[model samples]
Target chain A: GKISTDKYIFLTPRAYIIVHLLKVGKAKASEISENTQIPYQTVIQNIRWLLAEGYVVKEQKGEEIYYKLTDKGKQLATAELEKIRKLVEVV
Target chain B: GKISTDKYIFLTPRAYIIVHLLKVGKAKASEISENTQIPYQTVIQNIRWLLAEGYVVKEQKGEEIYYKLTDKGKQLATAELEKIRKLVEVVQ
Candidate 1:
């Protein structure tokens, strides 16, 4: 049974982006795409999601937009990373 | 770089089974499919993978087979369910 209606997403590149933002501090979508090798469009899409979900917040400097994990986002990222990493050990 | 070697997988349908087996103790392939509303074919496929991967084990009785979470699988399921449930709230 679909236990939850969360759409059963695989939070890879998106989770990776959150962990990256946590470690390195705030960065633009371009920076995440370049560093992580995720497609820029994908980065934008996930960032859009993270923002709406309150997992991330945006900062603007004139034409530049940067993003960082919210405190709530960090908590979920921590929880998500731990479980995903543990599964990594098994799989 | 990819964070880890684990094939990035969605744990749904799969994690759901572990949680179910944990609560119910054991069940047959048919029971799981019926209760979970997952297709029988998909249930068998996932059960096969879980059996091979040691996340679940099978018990047999004459013509019937039953499945339950292994100890290791239960631990992962508990942990996975915690985060998953949390994600569920945000999404809902």
Candidate 2:
């Protein structure tokens, strides 16, 4: 079953950032922004949505906030990546 | 590079209907409804979205409307199916 959230989150490039980082494991917002090269604010906003949707959990480690994938998040990210791979294969 | 239409279209159960139907090809509305167990009206509505997005094309033969997948539609459907398959594998 699909996560019943606003579709904008899934369709955006920000979603890719969230999924890629979650797959890689817990990281600070700045780390994710650096990896994706998206604006830090955009990464933070997308992380908030992922957290709200129960796909990610945020932990405060000292002064930094680290986001990790929830089980649901991992499942969704793997699925989405596979989907992109299939399309790439076809196209 | 996802379809940039209203987020509601992608989020709805209707999007699945369109993708599945386009993959199968040239199916009548009633046929899609029967196969998917979705209501005919909902199928029709979703078909409109697919058509609008350039993912599907409609052909009218006699009184029936047949929907076929465009190249874009095929790509999207295949991708979505793989995504589902991956999730299923991980879950299992």
Candidate 3:
């Protein structure tokens, strides 16, 4: 039961963004894109994928848009971060 | 000299293959394909890309072929693994 390939399925960019949101709470896509210092469109691409896959929920209050983890997303993020913790320690 | 956005650049398939080569020395494309349970053509397609990109050497003698990491590749893989390992540690 303990032997799991959970982390193997943890996509790096996906995991990276989720782990940050898990710590910092919700934020705009602009925050993620700027923080990563990458092309804005590519950063939004993964964020959009997350939204479509239901790992995240997007809220719009007037013209402003924000995203936060869904319960499923939190579970995934936590499991992934913990797995990463283990991998960092083990290696 | 250690900062990188490398895991981004290293495709999952490429990392998947290189990490194994780091562990087990040389191997065949068929073995990697079978071991990963993915399509053989997909596996070798990445392998061929790596070979052409100078990350791995494609060796042939008689009817057998083998793949192994180059010095450049070894360095890249080592750096990437270290980055991932560090990322795992620094979550905050």
Backbone clash count, each prediction separately: 1, 0, 0
lDDT of 3 by residue, B18-53 (tens): 666776788888898766444577678667766776
The per-candidate TM-score of the B chain, in the order shown, comes to: 0.74, 0.71, 0.77
TM-score of each model, in listed order:
0.48, 0.51, 0.74
DockQ of each: 0.11, 0.15, 0.11
Give a tens-digit lDDT track for model 2, residues B1-85.
Answer: 1222223321344544645555465687787777766568766866776688787787887876778888887776666555534
lDDT score of residue B84 within candidate 1? 44
lDDT per residue (tens digit) for residues A1-91 in model 3: 1111223212345555675676667877888767654446655777776777777878786898988899988776656556445433433
* Model 1 Cα RMSD, 1 decimal: 9.5
Question: What DockQ was computed for model 3?
Answer: 0.11
- Candidate 1, residues B27-52, lDDT tens digits: the string is 97888887865568767877887787
lDDT of 1 by residue, A1-91 (tens): 3222222322445655775686677878989888866779867876777777777888888988888888988777666656544433432
Worst ten-residue run, lDDT, model 1 chain A? A1-10
Cα RMSD to the true fold for all candidates = 9.5, 7.4, 8.2
Rank order (by TM-score, best first) = 3, 2, 1
What candidate 3 gets wrong by more than 4 Å, as runs, is A1-12, A59-63, A79-91, B1-11
Q: What stretches of model 1 exceed 4 Å from their correct place?
A: A1-91, B1-11, B86-92
Top DockQ hit: 2
